[PDB]
């Protein structure tokens, strides 16, 4: 129901 | 390759010749452990001359 992709740890910028 | 059994403190002696000799591409082709190294066949008799200083 939300983002749930830990994007700040895989693509930090 | 050519299996050569040596001393752990003496293994790095042949590694210094690898980065200094410009004859071929690379002297040591494979390093098993601290007491086993490999080599293109040609420098055992030449190494016997360096025993006088070693």
């Amino acid at each position: 129901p939300w983002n749930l992709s830990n994007d700040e740890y895989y693509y930090p910028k | 390759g050519v299996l050569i059994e040596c001393d752990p403190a003496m293994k790095q002696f042949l590694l210094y010749l690898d980065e200094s000799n410009a004859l071929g591409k690379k002297f040591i082709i494979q390093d098993i452990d601290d007491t086993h190294v490999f080599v293109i066949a040609e420098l055992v008799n030449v190494l016997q001359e360096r025993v006088g200083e070693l």
């Binding site: 129901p1 749930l4 830990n6 693509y11 930090p12 910028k13 | 690379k26 390093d31």
Partner: protein
């Protein structure tokens, strides 16, 4: 340039519908077309019509003579003894081409009266007034009339237009092609308590003189095709969007709060699609209708979308919010690029499907993150390589057969198999991602904005198609607009991935040359398989060495096999320094497993998925473990999980367990690591030291600190440990002991997870977690040890299975009194009873599933019960159950259920062509040939499903089991 295949040009069409009778399932109406002949001596005018009884036709108020014949009603003759499928496919393609409006043809042939020939030679207007009647439609308009008494608005009866592609001929006579654009005037005289939703904007709503009926007048000034015109008449609850005010949402009665919560996100979808493209939404209104017994889950017409009510959820329902959200998003993407910009031929359909799927993927990227985007792209690519290696290949943009490796003709959308249609849309959006890879994303959005801007300057003119054909896109026009905005042409990429119909297969293996410090890759292609083709372009490879991550481009010509790339130092093993990753960060790695002589940690062939490929790389197991742990790409973590199943060493168990314990890993990687850890644990029995896999980890993550066997009370507010918590016992139940039986330590753990479940404290529902608990109980069932075919009775039941059977009985009975959100526990318990019947535990009796497959049940229960009956008639070779299923295909009220029964009977067939079965009569061949020929003549999706079933059962040649 667009030249019409029709000799006339249609300008305006009036569709008036009166007398919608819900008791008799009947509509009456007329249709008035305004055509301009482009060629003199027009004589006959050929229109499209199915199922409508044509009463009279008047051309310019003069009585005209029409003749009707539909060759697609009975495709082959009844007295032809042919029984092969290639004959039927050619005859069906010829029959569909004989009613095709994309040629000059059509089903209703009207003859122009003689006195109008001097009006038609000097090209002046003709106004054709047909009046028709649908007596009891089997297609097109679907009447959902419940059997509660009361008025038709009090019982909840409604009509909606169903079908796919050109299926508007099924409820009024038209020119049912996507290329005949005209303006529209739509009047519907419905009951006073009902509302009629359609395309355009509602100009007025007048009462009738008795005030018992009212007429809804719609006008559509944007020129759309007849195939984009829809209708939904019912007692709908109206809800104006509180954010965007031209958007109205219609639901069935008593479902207004679900509609309020569900359609509350749609303004963000509107804002996204209007800011990546720079055109505003082209239509003046937007209407979302939620209905019962829908054809597809989401249909998109001009200025209107028809969804099923099964998408409506409340605020406490998770695991359904993203699915409904993305259904709304792809309906809006098709509003932009399937309904406003239309198709010029049946070729150039890949353009529209690709643009719709590509901008919907951009929406998914922004909304759910780049990681969910990569996971979705990888699952679509795996889907297409599985389908293309299975059967032939999908050919985007064929040229008119061009694809003769497959049992249907690809000249028309209504002869395609449904799986081919799904894979067509899938491959179209992946090829559009490839075009974005060659020509950057901002230029791609500029292409789309140029197409939309040409269409919207075209959409306001009044000239009858002098300029209205700029709203139709083609392949050549799309490539020309790409070449206009970028200066590069993509003709090699178009020639490889569109015109050629194949995917590539890569087999890679490396060797590190220590002497010259190089990495010798060895990439060979399998190009002799039936689905494959040969790749000769460039290929990216990413090598992670100790000095960092380096990309290399390899030129893979036909005669190429060995590619020598250079390698860097290994001075980050001399000192302990951090090894820099693919992104800017750097980590501490345990380099004890790495080789001493090689610096390279892992290799990835084609990391960005820049080709349509299937890679089979041969790394070492420590390289797969390093790629699982320290990679910053989710597709590489997934492929390392997939490749670690072949290496059951304890270092791989440590790698997957460290992935499972790790938050700040993407959650769908941990959900895969559960099943990978279960498979590895099953393979290293008689070596496993401590407890079963993931149990201690479950008690560490999700149970109480003071009580290990009591689970914590449910708080599902994190949405990543919720998914991991509900997927971990399902994988944990696949554990097996040395005796091949599930251990009683994991089964007891699952039963204690079921008993101590308390959900009185979270703001979310528990139906999916409990349904997954039933799925975990079903996974633990091993086949029973029947002796001398002993009858399975209650006393000789397994002591393990009696607990499982008690739990699923309790769950199903409690669902009968307190139901779940979509009867998820009914579906899970029916699936588990079929699991217990598939092994020798419960008697193999289909009567329970036959009672759950009746008409009055929810559609998820119906398809789960019918899946159980299809599995039963495959295993027990039942003749009467197959006749039951074929009868249910012939006469069921819901056509989605008929399509699903044909689909499940194709996926899990009762016999294949290789099998000798008792169910290989001439009677079954005659029944299935009659089902292809007649019987399925009203749906275009049941007929392709019957063709698929006949192909799966009897093959392309003559049925063998026949005189």
């Amino acid at each position: 340039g667009f030249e019409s295949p029709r000799p006339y040009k249609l300008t305006h069409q009036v569709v008036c519908i009166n007398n919608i009778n819900f008791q008799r399932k009947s509509v009456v109406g007329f249709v008035e077309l305004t055509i301009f002949p482009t060629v003199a001596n027009l004589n006959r005018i050929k229109l499209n019509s199915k199922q409508c009884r044509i009463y009279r036709v008047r051309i310019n108020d003069l009585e005209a003579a029409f003749i009707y014949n539909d060759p697609t009603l009975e495709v082959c003759h009844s007295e032809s003894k042919q029984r092969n499928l290639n004959y039927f496919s050619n005859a069906y393609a010829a029959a569909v081409s004989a009613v095709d409006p994309d040629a000059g043809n059509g089903e209703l042939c009207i003859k122009v009266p003689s006195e109008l020939w001097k009006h038609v030679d000097e090209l002046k207007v003709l106004k054709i007034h047909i009046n028709f009647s649908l007596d009891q439609p089997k297609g097109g308009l679907h009447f959902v009339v419940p059997s509660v008494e009361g008025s038709m608005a009090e019982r909840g009866a409604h009509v909606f237009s169903c079908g796919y592609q050109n299926s508007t001929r099924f409820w009024f006579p038209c020119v049912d092609s996507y290329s005949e654009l005209c303006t529209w005037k739509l009047e519907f005289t419905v009951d006073a308590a009902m509302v009629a939703v359609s395309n355009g904007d509602l100009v007025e709503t007048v009462y009738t003189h008795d005030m018992r009926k009212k007429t809804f007048h719609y006008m559509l000034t944007i020129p759309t095709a007849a195939s984009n015109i829809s209708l939904a008449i019912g007692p709908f609850e109206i809800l104006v969007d509180p954010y965007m005010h031209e958007v109205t949402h219609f639901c069935l009665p008593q479902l207004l709060p679900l509609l309020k919560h569900t359609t509350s996100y749609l303004h963000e979808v509107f804002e996204f699609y209007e800011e990546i493209l720079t055109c505003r939404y082209p239509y003046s209104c937007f209407k979302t209708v939620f209905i019962d017994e829908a054809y597809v889950e989401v249909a998109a017409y001009a200025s209107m979308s028809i969804f099923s009510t099964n998408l409506l959820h409340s605020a406490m329902i998770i695991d359904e919010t993203p699915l409904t959200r993305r259904c709304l998003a792809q309906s809006l993407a098709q509003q932009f690029f399937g309904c406003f910009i239309s198709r010029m031929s049946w070729s150039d359909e890949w353009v529209l499907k690709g643009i719709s799927g590509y901008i919907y993927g951009l929406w998914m990227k922004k909304t759910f993150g780049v990681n969910e985007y990569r996971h979705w792209i990888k699952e679509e690519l795996d889907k297409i390589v599985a389908y293309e290696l299975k059967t032939g290949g999908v050919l985007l943009h064929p040229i008119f057969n061009p694809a003769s490796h497959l049992h249907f003709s690809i000249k028309h959308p209504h002869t395609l198999s449904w799986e081919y249609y799904s894979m067509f849309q899938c491959k179209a959006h992946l090829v559009m991602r490839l075009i974005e890879n060659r020509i950057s994303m901002e230029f791609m959005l500029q292409v789309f904005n140029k197409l939309l801007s040409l269409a919207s300057t075209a959409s306001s003119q009044k000239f009858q198609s002098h300029m209205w054909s700029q709203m139709l896109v083609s392949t050549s026009g799309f490539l020309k607009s790409i070449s206009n905005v970028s200066g590069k042409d993509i003709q090699p990429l178009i020639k490889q991935w569109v015109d050629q119909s194949g995917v590539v297969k890569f087999y890679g293996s490396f060797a590190f040359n220590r002497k010259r410090n190089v990495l010798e890759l060895e990439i060979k292609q399998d190009y002799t398989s039936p689905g494959t083709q040969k790749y000769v372009g460039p290929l990216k490879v990413t090598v992670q060495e100790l000095d960092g991550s380096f990309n290399h481009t390899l030129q893979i010509e036909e005669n190429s096999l060995k590619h020598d790339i250079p390698c860097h130092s290994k001075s980050r093993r001399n000192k302990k320094k951090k090894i820099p990753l693919m992104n800017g960060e750097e980590v501490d790695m345990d380099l004890s497993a790495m080789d001493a002589d090689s610096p390279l940690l892992w290799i990835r062939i084609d990391p960005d998925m820049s080709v349509l490929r299937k890679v089979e790389f041969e790394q070492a197991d420590f390289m797969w473990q390093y790629q699982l742990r320290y990679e910053r790409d989710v597709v590489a973590q997934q492929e390392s999980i997939l490749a670690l199943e072949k290496f059951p060493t304890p270092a791989s168990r440590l790698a997957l367990t460290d992935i499972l314990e790790q938050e700040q890993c993407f959650y769908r990687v941990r959900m895969s690591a559960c099943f990978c850890l279960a498979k590895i644990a099953n393979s290293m029995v008689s070596t496993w030291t401590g407890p079963p896999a993931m149990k201690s980890l479950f008690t560490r993550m999700f149970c109480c600190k003071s009580c290990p066997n009591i689970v914590k009370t449910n708080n599902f507010m994190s949405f990543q440990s919720y998914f991991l918590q509900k997927t971990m016992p399902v994988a944990m139940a696949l554990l097996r002991d040395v005796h091949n039986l599930c251990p009683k330590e994991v089964l007891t753990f699952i039963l204690d997870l079921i008993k101590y479940n308390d959900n009185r404290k979270n703001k979310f529902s528990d139906n999916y977690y409990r349904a997954e608990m039933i799925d975990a109980l079903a996974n633990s069932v091993t086949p029973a040890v029947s002796v001398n075919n002993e009858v399975r009775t209650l006393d000789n039941l397994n002591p393990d299975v009696r607990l499982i059977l008690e739990e699923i009985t309790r769950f199903l009975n409690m669902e009968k009194l307190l139901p779940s959100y979509r009867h998820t526990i009914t579906v899970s318990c029916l699936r588990a009873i079929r699991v217990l019947q598939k092994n020798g535990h419960v008697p193999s009796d289909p009567a329970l599933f036959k009672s759950y497959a009746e008409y009055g049940h929810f559609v998820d229960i119906r398809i789960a019960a019918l899946e159980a009956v299809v599995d039963y008639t495959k295993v027990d070779r039942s003749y009467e159950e197959l006749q039951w299923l074929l009868n249910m295909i012939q006469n069921d009220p819901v056509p989605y259920v008929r399509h699903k029964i044909l689909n499940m009977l194709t996926k899990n067939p009762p016999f294949t062509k290789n099998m000798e079965s008792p169910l290989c009569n001439e009677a079954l061949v005659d029944q299935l040939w009659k089902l292809m020929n007649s019987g399925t003549s009203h749906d275009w999706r049941l007929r392709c499903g019957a063709v698929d079933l006949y192909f799966t059962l009897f093959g392309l040649s003559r049925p063998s089991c026949l005189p």
